[PDB]
Amino acid sequence: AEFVPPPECPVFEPSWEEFTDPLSFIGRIRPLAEKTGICKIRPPKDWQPPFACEVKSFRFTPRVQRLNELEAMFEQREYTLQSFGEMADNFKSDYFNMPVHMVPTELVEKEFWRLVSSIEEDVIVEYGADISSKDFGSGFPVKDGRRKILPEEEEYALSGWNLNNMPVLEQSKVPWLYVGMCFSSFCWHIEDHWSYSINYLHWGEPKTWYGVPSHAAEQLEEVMRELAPELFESQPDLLHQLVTIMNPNVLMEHGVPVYRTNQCAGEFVVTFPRAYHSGFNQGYNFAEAVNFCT
Ligand SMILES: O=C(O)c1ccnc2cc(-c3nc4ccccc4n3CCN3CCCCC3)sc12
Ligand SMILES: [Mn+2]
Numbered sequence: 245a246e247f248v249p250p251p252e253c254p255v256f257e258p259s260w261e262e263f264t265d266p267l268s269f270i271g272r273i274r275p276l277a278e279k280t281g282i283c284k285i286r287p288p289k290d291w292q293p294p295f296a297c298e299v300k301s302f303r304f305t306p307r308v309q310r311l312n313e314l315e316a317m318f319e320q321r322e323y324t325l326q327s328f329g330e331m332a333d334n335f336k337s338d339y340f341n342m343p344v345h346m347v348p349t350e351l352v353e354k355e356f357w358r359l360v361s362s363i364e365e366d367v368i369v370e371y372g373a374d375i376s377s378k379d380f381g382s383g384f385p386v387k388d389g390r391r392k393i394l395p396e397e398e399e400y401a402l403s404g405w406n407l408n409n410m411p412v413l414e415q416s417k418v419p420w421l422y423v424g425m426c427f428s429s430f431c432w433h434i435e436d437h438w439s440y441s442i443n444y445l446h447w448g449e450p451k452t453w454y455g456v457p458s459h460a461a462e463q464l465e466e467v468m469r470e471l472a473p474e475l476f477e478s479q480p481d482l483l484h485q486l487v488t489i490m491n492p493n494v495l496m497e498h499g500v501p502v503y504r505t506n507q508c509a510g511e512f513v514v515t516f517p518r519a520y521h522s523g524f525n526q527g528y529n530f531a532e533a534v535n536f537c538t
Contacts (some may be wrong), residue, residue: 284505359427
């Protein structure tokens with residue numbers, strides 16, 4: 245039948261007192277959030293960092309994504325932020341025959357998973373994924389000198405929730421940028437070294453997430469290995485994770501607990517250690533993410 249949305253993951257709305265430092269806050273929500281794999285954090289209403297990327301010079305060549313590439317078993321355009329947004333909005337409004345902001349998030353979700361398994365329709369999108377923040381700057385203001393920081397921006401340049409200020413060292417990395425369009429996606433994966441990840445949506449349409457708690461990681465990997473094609477089943481996990489696309493209902497039918505969320509502009513998503521996650525974008529948006537350890 246049609247897609248059944250997984251239950252919603254926890255959403256936290258901390259006060260200014262609880263919003264003091266992300267490390268301590270993540271530590272306190274851990275008893276609940278680690279049981280759901282992912283969680284969403286809404287900052288206080290007055291916490292609004294200004295977008296600090298060099299929009300004039302922001303040029304990139306996104307990667308081509310064919311939604312049904314696994315069910316089928318020549319694709320190779322430079323955009324600006326503006327020209328990519330025009331292409332993205334035109335694609336979505338043309339696909340759904342309605343203004344982009346009027347398409348329900350549930351409809352994009354059900355259509356995405358239908359297209360992923362559809363053998364009759366071949367939908368192709370583009371994703372500006374894994375763009376280094378060293379190339380055109382971070383979405384957050386930073387004390388760098390390459391871009392002037394206004395007095396109203398210094399608070400955000402020094403904020404602990406600025407992803408450039410996260411601790412990224414283990415015991416013995418820069419944020420990445422993601423320019424999304426409708427149906428652009430990332431498949432199921434965990435982070436290197438089982439690290440945390442934190443993801444901020446600077447602006448645009450929501451990013452839809454799916455998460456699995458770490459206690460079900462082995463269960464997910466066994467389901468993924470049982471249903472993956474024989475050519476990819478024996479591949480190392482770092483390589484298999486490039487094509488690990490799977491409908492969440494298939495995991496839920498095999499007893500895997502899965503949670504979902506729509507990450508809206510200005511909201512954080514935190515993934516916990518060894519919490520498998522995947523998702524897709526509802527439309528033209530801009531996200532920034534970094535891995536960190538506690
Ligand atoms: O799209 C989001 O918003 C999002 C949210 C959470 N996790 C992820 C992971 C993503 C991803 N797609 C890939 C396609 C090919 C190869 C690697 C890919 N990777 C991980 C990239 N990884 C290693 C290289 C440097 C950057 C970090 S996209 C994404
Ligand atoms: Mn990730």
